Amino acid sequence: GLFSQKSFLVLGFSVENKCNIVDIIREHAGKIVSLPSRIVADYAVVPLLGCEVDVTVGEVVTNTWLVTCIDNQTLVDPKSNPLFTPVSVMSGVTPLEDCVISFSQCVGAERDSLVFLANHLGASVQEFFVRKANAKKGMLASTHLIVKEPTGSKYEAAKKWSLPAVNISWLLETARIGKRADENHFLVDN
């Protein structure tokens, strides 16, 4: 099994989400530690923004890391993506309420967590990266493009329309400070 010889704790989820996460782990040979225990679990699966963890574990990881491992049939390093460990977000603030964000080169559970962060920070997320606003199509004008690497259809339009194309770390730095981070510090060309 994928998670064979691995023990897990599942914390911070509702009753229904916990069962889905529990069954997913067991279907891949994973072991579930029932608290309280003397077993130091290898992993503690927590929500993206984290939760209270009062038991010593090997690594605290998110549901996004878990689902990414299953989609790729590979035990992915939790340290290879900031979304695989709890994301620090300043609560009570919506610093991106003035933004209209479109994503590119983001697929799967990584995209869903990113869309979760953008909406949690007040932003409006659109599948389209448009020039100007078109009310007749339900589309608003775009303000930011979040891409991983240069090149691509949306990226070439961002340089052409003078709209900021930034890394994912701009979204994460915004979430940590509670203020809209400077796009010039997170441009993709640099």
């Binding site: 389209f128 448009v130 020039r131 589309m139 259809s153």
Partner: peptide, 6 residues
Amino acid sequence: FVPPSP
């Protein structure tokens, strides 16, 4: 307006 990637 750039369409979304497939």
